[PDB]
Design an enzyme around this catalytic site. Structure first.
Site, PDB file in Angstrom:
ATOM      1  N   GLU B  63      -5.428  -1.990   2.309  1.00 14.32           N
ATOM      2  CA  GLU B  63      -6.043  -0.756   2.886  1.00 14.32           C
ATOM      3  C   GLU B  63      -6.750  -1.031   4.187  1.00 14.32           C
ATOM      4  O   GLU B  63      -6.739  -0.135   5.082  1.00 14.32           O
ATOM      5  CB  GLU B  63      -7.022  -0.090   1.841  1.00 14.32           C
ATOM      6  CG  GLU B  63      -6.263   0.586   0.673  1.00 14.32           C
ATOM      7  CD  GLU B  63      -5.752  -0.383  -0.404  1.00 14.32           C
ATOM      8  OE1 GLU B  63      -6.068  -1.612  -0.418  1.00 14.32           O
ATOM      9  OE2 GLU B  63      -4.914   0.080  -1.202  1.00 14.32           O
ATOM     10  N   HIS B 133      -9.821   6.066 -10.678  1.00 15.64           N
ATOM     11  CA  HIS B 133      -8.823   7.087 -10.360  1.00 15.64           C
ATOM     12  C   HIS B 133      -9.494   8.457 -10.188  1.00 15.64           C
ATOM     13  O   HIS B 133      -8.794   9.466 -10.112  1.00 15.64           O
ATOM     14  CB  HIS B 133      -7.738   7.204 -11.461  1.00 15.64           C
ATOM     15  CG  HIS B 133      -6.578   6.261 -11.285  1.00 15.64           C
ATOM     16  ND1 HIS B 133      -5.396   6.409 -11.976  1.00 15.64           N
ATOM     17  CD2 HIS B 133      -6.422   5.160 -10.511  1.00 15.64           C
ATOM     18  CE1 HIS B 133      -4.560   5.434 -11.638  1.00 15.64           C
ATOM     19  NE2 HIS B 133      -5.143   4.693 -10.710  1.00 15.64           N
TER      20      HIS B 133
HETATM   21  C1  LIG Z   1      -6.990  -1.684  -3.718  1.00 17.87           C
HETATM   22  C2  LIG Z   1      -5.892  -0.981  -4.462  1.00 17.87           C
HETATM   23  N1  LIG Z   1      -4.911  -0.302  -3.868  1.00 17.87           N
HETATM   24  C3  LIG Z   1      -3.933   0.321  -4.570  1.00 17.87           C
HETATM   25  C4  LIG Z   1      -3.859   0.220  -5.959  1.00 17.87           C
HETATM   26  C5  LIG Z   1      -2.729   0.978  -6.734  1.00 17.87           C
HETATM   27  N2  LIG Z   1      -1.812   0.007  -7.361  1.00 17.87           N
HETATM   28  C6  LIG Z   1      -2.043  -0.254  -8.791  1.00 17.87           C
HETATM   29  S1  LIG Z   1      -0.722  -1.482  -9.084  1.00 17.87           S
HETATM   30  C7  LIG Z   1      -0.055  -1.528  -7.476  1.00 17.87           C
HETATM   31  C8  LIG Z   1       1.125  -2.456  -7.185  1.00 17.87           C
HETATM   32  C9  LIG Z   1       0.568  -3.878  -7.492  1.00 17.87           C
HETATM   33  O1  LIG Z   1       1.556  -4.824  -7.166  1.00 17.87           O
HETATM   34  P1  LIG Z   1       1.432  -6.329  -7.602  1.00 17.87           P
HETATM   35  O2  LIG Z   1       0.159  -6.846  -7.114  1.00 17.87           O
HETATM   36  O3  LIG Z   1       2.686  -6.959  -7.183  1.00 17.87           O
HETATM   37  O4  LIG Z   1       1.399  -6.307  -9.241  1.00 17.87           O
HETATM   38  P2  LIG Z   1       2.466  -5.869 -10.323  1.00 17.87           P
HETATM   39  O5  LIG Z   1       2.121  -4.391 -10.683  1.00 17.87           O
HETATM   40  O6  LIG Z   1       3.868  -6.037  -9.688  1.00 17.87           O
HETATM   41  O7  LIG Z   1       2.261  -6.789 -11.479  1.00 17.87           O
HETATM   42  C10 LIG Z   1      -0.777  -0.610  -6.705  1.00 17.87           C
HETATM   43  C11 LIG Z   1      -0.467  -0.379  -5.216  1.00 17.87           C
HETATM   44  C12 LIG Z   1      -4.915  -0.528  -6.575  1.00 17.87           C
HETATM   45  N3  LIG Z   1      -5.042  -0.650  -7.883  1.00 17.87           N
HETATM   46  N4  LIG Z   1      -5.892  -1.128  -5.806  1.00 17.87           N
END
Ligand SMILES: Cc1ncc(C[n+]2csc(CCOP(=O)(O)OP(=O)(O)O)c2C)c(N)n1
Ligand SMILES: Cc1ncc(C[n+]2csc(CCOP(=O)(O)OP(=O)(O)O)c2C)c(N)n1
Ligand SMILES: [Cl-]
Ligand SMILES: [Cl-]
Ligand SMILES: [K+]
Ligand SMILES: [K+]
Ligand SMILES: [K+]
Ligand SMILES: [K+]
Ligand SMILES: [Mn+2]
Ligand SMILES: [Mn+2]
Lengths: 375, 329, 375, 329
Positions: B63, B133
């Site tokens: 972000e 959320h």
């Molecule tokens: C700071 C922030 N931005 C956005 C999110 C929304 N979000 C929840 S999971 C995710 C994808 C996460 O990807 P990764 O780190 O690869 O983990 P995976 O779900 O593939 O295990 C996002 C963008 C969040 N939780 N925190």
């Protein structure tokens, strides 16, 4: 044979950790030695005399300005200053390799870039004095320069915030079919900030025409690099993001120019980021030198001598002192200007605050230093 | 009055605003996490296929980078519409918003700016969102001169306010109440139209008390006004603030001079919440008209809970009870 | 011969940019093939039967729990769920290599770590239901687990914020002479956040006993890794920070165990960080498999068969369903609990808000779903 | 009353607090940018030589890392005293403070916490600091349940309040008015002592008007009280708030019930500033006692300027004029 989407690699059947190469790191590119001698003829850019003299005069004029404004700060005539000592070669060597209209984002220690772009002495001074000639309207701390004409984005104190911004301006330039590159300068300390990781990754994944130019002077205020990172400086980080990277001798104006020139050519052709880490040493932080190395070079080509050095030292002192006298005698801007440009249009509630100040000064103005403020 | 309309829910109205913007402004781009496939709330469906991968694109998961990058696009003069996936996750970008975006024009003497940046982000409670959320961060941004913060109450309002933010020459944060994205549709003009920033809307005239809110909480106070009329014979003037900063001081004060009583409500926690600014300002401007203390009915001063949400929110019963006491003061 | 404090390097006299190796990246460590056969005998950990059966039963019990709670979410009995499909091997293989008292920070997708540490089914359920048995007092979204007894720090939604925290807990452990290591799990998407750059650099410069465990499943929600980064995944970033790094086959419980075991031994002995990137594929995001590969291995050693598989599938379904029935019939916590633990001691003004709720519910309680809340 | 004292300026009083903490709490560590050599404001001089390089140490240049790291130390139970070099630069850490530190105990049901974290940072105007050396960010943090925010007015107050923050079982932000670091010394006990959090101090009793401020602005309102007495025959009760959250509502309201008039002043911008919370709360609790509207005399709603600083700050003339009008209302 591995099929994972996240990486392209083979299998290995033995456990082996990948070790960093820090003791023998990325080598330091150099064109001329400490005596100003070209080391490898195939690498000499053979810049013409007028251009090499402009590199030299820009560095030394900056140094003349620095000595005078540093004294001005010690006497309390300006509230803050910080010199460019030891950085003059990185500034001027890189600026000379850019197009005039390439956009510059900086960190705070690149007045030489503006100097090479012919920024008036009166305007460096006006910003340090916060006088009526300052297009920044006296709002920022001294040694926060900006110039829209010369494509030099206003510098801000928070470290590294310009790095992801520079990437966005480069993405925008790519779309505009600008044939323009953005350069973004920062120190090795600022490279520890989260925004550096943001900018470096975004420039790679969004394929942006940007040069990241890190000045590594071994210190961030009191912090030596041993406390700043443990990999092989900043250059070794570039490949992990997919960025082509190089380390140069920041005291060598020709090594800086050559690396910047080639980074610019490829960044603009290929829409890909380049990282240049220029190694220097912080000679001055705030309130084997690039100039002497270039002087030795000039004195070889037969293009400078003691008579010329004397006359230029005189002429540059006179120009700096003329600007300094004018800057000190200009009034400051009208106090009304503290309220404009917060938004493009002043909100009615902000106008009300302006009017309240004007009333206040009507009654209580004897208590304010209104002597050298405009109107 | 605005040409052909269709029924649109609030996510569809945001897509409509964004499509109209892309169509008429060739510089505009939209970017953020997961926007390419249409976004996690469907707000960008269809836009990449329609406008191109260079104009609607995913960023890395960062972000602070999203906002910094958007600032940089806007410095060149191009329209930058950044998405933050939930308002709860805007805080990594707080330094780029407060120290950079908001101060960009002032600190350069107007040599540079990032007026063509809009940051849009889902906002407010959603029934079960819990701590990360559900948040409504507007009071954090309200204390930052140089940014505008705007919150719509409906699909029609959302499209008109979002178009104004995108076109405004100042960096704007547009908070979209996520619990309304798939709630009731209403008619929304297909072609572009604007609703002014820094302008509240009186949506029901009344003479006994002024009620002020924004986002979903507007619908709560509209229902409170009905309960008050039916149960108490009390006439409520219901006002949607719409823009948090710069806010419409004159519309609120003109109403309170008339009614003499003000209740402000928001989902955000009480302490340091934006009701605090409205109340203290109305108190200064309308002191002699005030019949009762100005009431603030807000979330409690806790993080936003999962299982306890129904007990946490400043719902219509909490607002009604507060109103009842104020009428009786 | 270069004398710059920022890096240890030689000079080079020709301009050469350093290119990333992405097409042939860091190879993927693997111990057993897709048929469960050991590839290189010298690398076999020869774990004893009871331990390998615990790896297998932990993965499958997690999978049984996942199917049932995923169905519970689809029916609206719990408000959210997200499964561990494809990640079970990284979870259990790494947890088995840790000391019981090594502290774990996670990202959200490591229920298998708690499962391996014998976290009760009743407690996974209690958190998803936010019932009175939840030690989190029903305050977080489902699938946000924590356990102080089992040294598993409560998971939070904001990505990557646990990474610099984990480094601080490791620094503290170093000072305490704990002989303990911290592990910190995160996905490849979270590695793009600024806090990842913070944690990786701090762990190196402050010399912390920490394992960074990145699960690279090729996706962050809808975003493929081609949009996430352009270097050679996350493993290639480690050396730039001075961190020893390795990439493993995340579908291979033995490769995961071996790399974690050796990282733990060296991190605790040497007070230095290690980075493990485990390659998987996201089989399920929210509301060639590790289990079958390990099943094939067991079926070789003669340590499992169809009869045992059937009985265990039955027994695990029964245990999961017993826990599920109990979790659904428990009341939720008293609504008073929305106010405690904001500070250690509730401020008088917060107490006043609690009292105001209690009054409100006295008058208006028929309007609240007070049926299955405690008291 | 507290044993032997020495004259200490405010930087020296902070060093004294930190030294006393290290001495009595073997878990405690101090870290941040440039703290090892003694800090850019000399607050940590001598401490590394005295306590060891493992206990007083420099971090990389990364505020989000500094706070995240400090949270992690505190999760293990060890005392973590992080420094942010100027409060203007705390914003990179806003997400670690607001989404993590403040919510750590609540969201785990008290299974984990970071109560042993204190973040200390220079704060407030300094004559020429302009946009990024002058800020007073307390209102941004005031809207975050779960953190305490504390601001002293003097060397004695600073050491006693800092010791309380370090020892408090909640994450605390301690803002040190930098324009006082080398200003007048006063006597400060050499050994440890505490001043309570969430407690205002009435430093001058008065009967006509209540004046509330914090940090350096306390000295401004003390001088205003003198101007009021001499020029207007007006008796001012002067209150130092000390803790911004959780704040001492009872001390302020008890004073306003007595005087019937309240003026609050702070260097931070007016809109969304903490005076907004005090005014709206006092209005709710003391409505029937209020003789005049509650006055807020604050910085303007702009970024903090370099050359215009003398015109921007809510100085004694601005406060006096506001007070004069309020007396005449
Ligand atoms: C700071 C922030 N931005 C956005 C999110 C929304 N979000 C929840 S999971 C995710 C994808 C996460 O990807 P990764 O780190 O690869 O983990 P995976 O779900 O593939 O295990 C996002 C963008 C969040 N939780 N925190
Ligand atoms: C976000 C932030 N934190 C702290 C500072 C204070 N600060 C001003 S310069 C500096 C050291 C910068 O080091 P480096 O980036 O190496 O640049 P150099 O001064 O060596 O050119 C610091 C910590 C700042 N300006 N911004
Ligand atoms: Cl600076
Ligand atoms: Cl999640
Ligand atoms: K900057
Ligand atoms: K805009
Ligand atoms: K987290
Ligand atoms: K504390
Ligand atoms: Mn440096
Ligand atoms: Mn992933």
């Amino acid at each position: 044979k591995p099929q994972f989407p996240g990486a392209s690699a083979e299998f290995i059947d033995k456990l082996e950790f990948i070790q960093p190469n820090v003791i023998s790191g990325i080598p330091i590119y150099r064109v001329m030695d400490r005596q100003g001698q070209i080391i490898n003829p195939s690498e000499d850019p053979h810049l013409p005399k007028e251009k090499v003299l402009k590199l030299y005069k820009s560095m030394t004029l900056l140094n003349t300005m620095d000595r005078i404004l540093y004294e001005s700060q010690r006497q309390g005539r300006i509230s803050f200053y910080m010199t460019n000592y030891g950085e003059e070669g990185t500034h001027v060597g890189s600026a000379a390799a850019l197009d005039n209209t390439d956009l510059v984002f900086g960190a705070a220690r690149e007045a030489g870039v503006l100097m090479y772009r012919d920024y008036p002495l009166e305007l460096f001074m006006a910003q340090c004095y916060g006088n009526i000639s300052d297009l920044g309207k006296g709002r920022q701390m001294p040694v926060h320069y900006g110039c829209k004409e010369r494509h030099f984005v206003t510098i801000s104190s928070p470290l590294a915030t310009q790095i992801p911004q520079a990437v966005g301006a480069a993405y925008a330039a790519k779309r505009a079919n600008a044939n323009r590159v953005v350069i973004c300068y920062f120190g090795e300390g600022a490279a520890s900030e989260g925004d550096a990781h943001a900018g470096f990754n975004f420039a790679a994944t969004l394929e942006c025409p940007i040069i990241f130019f890190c000045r590594n002077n071994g210190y961030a205020i009191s912090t030596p690099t041993s406390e700043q990172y443990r990999g092989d400086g900043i250059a070794a980080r570039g490949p992990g993001y997919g960025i082509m990277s190089i380390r140069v001798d920041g005291n060598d104006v020709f090594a800086v120019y050559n690396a910047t020139k080639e980074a610019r050519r490829r960044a603009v052709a290929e829409n890909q980021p380049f990282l240049i880490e220029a190694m220097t040493y912080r000679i001055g932080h705030s309130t084997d030198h690039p100039i002497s190395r270039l002087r030795h070079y000039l004195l070889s080509q037969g293009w400078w001598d003691e008579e010329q050095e004397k006359a230029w030292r005189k002429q540059s002192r006179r120009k700096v002192m003329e600007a300094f006298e004018q800057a000190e005698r200009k009034p400051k801007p009208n106090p009304n200007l503290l309220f404009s440009d917060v938004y493009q249009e002043m909100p009615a509630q902000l106008r009300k605050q302006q009017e309240s100040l004007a009333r206040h000064l009507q009654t209580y103005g004897e208590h304010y230093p209104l002597d050298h403020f405009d109107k | 009055e605005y040409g052909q309309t269709q029924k649109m829910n609030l996510f569809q109205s945001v897509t409509s605003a964004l499509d109209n913007s892309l169509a008429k402004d060739p510089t505009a781009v939209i970017f953020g996490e997961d926007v390419a496939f249409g976004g996690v709330f469907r707000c960008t469906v269809g836009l990449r296929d329609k406008y191109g991968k260079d104009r609607v694109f995913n960023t890395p998961l960062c972000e602070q980078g999203i906002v910094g990058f958007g600032i940089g696009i806007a410095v060149t003069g191009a329209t930058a519409i950044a998405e933050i996936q939930f308002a709860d996750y805007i805080f990594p970008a707080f330094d780029q918003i407060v120290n950079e975006a908001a101060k960009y024009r002032y600190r350069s003497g107007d040599l540079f700016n990032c007026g063509s940046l809009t940051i849009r982000s889902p906002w407010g409670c959603v029934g079960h969102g819990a701590l990360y959320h559900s948040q409504s961060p507007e009071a954090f941004f309200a204390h930052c001169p140089g940014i505008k913060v705007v919150i719509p109450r409906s699909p029609f309002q959302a499209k008109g306010l979002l178009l104004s933010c995108i076109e405004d020459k100042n960096p704007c944060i547009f908070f979209e109440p996520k619990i309304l994205y798939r709630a009731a549709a209403e008619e929304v003009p297909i072609e572009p139209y604007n609703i002014p920033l820094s302008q509240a809307e009186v949506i029901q005239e009344g003479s006994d008390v002024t009620l002020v809110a924004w986002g979903t909480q507007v619908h709560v106070i509209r229902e409170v006004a009905s309960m008050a009329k039916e149960k108490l014979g009390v006439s409520c003037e219901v006002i949607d603030l719409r823009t948090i900063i710069p806010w419409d001081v004159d519309t609120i004060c003109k109403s309170v001079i008339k009614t003499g009583r003000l209740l402000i409500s928001h989902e955000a926690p009480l302490t340091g919440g934006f009701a605090s600014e409205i109340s203290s300002t109305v108190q200064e401007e309308c002191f002699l008209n005030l019949e009762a203390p100005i009431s603030r009915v807000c979330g409690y001063d806790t993080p936003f809970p999962h299982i306890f949400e129904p007990f946490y929110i400043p719902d219509k019963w909490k607002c009604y009870d507060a109103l009842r006491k104020m009428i009786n003061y």
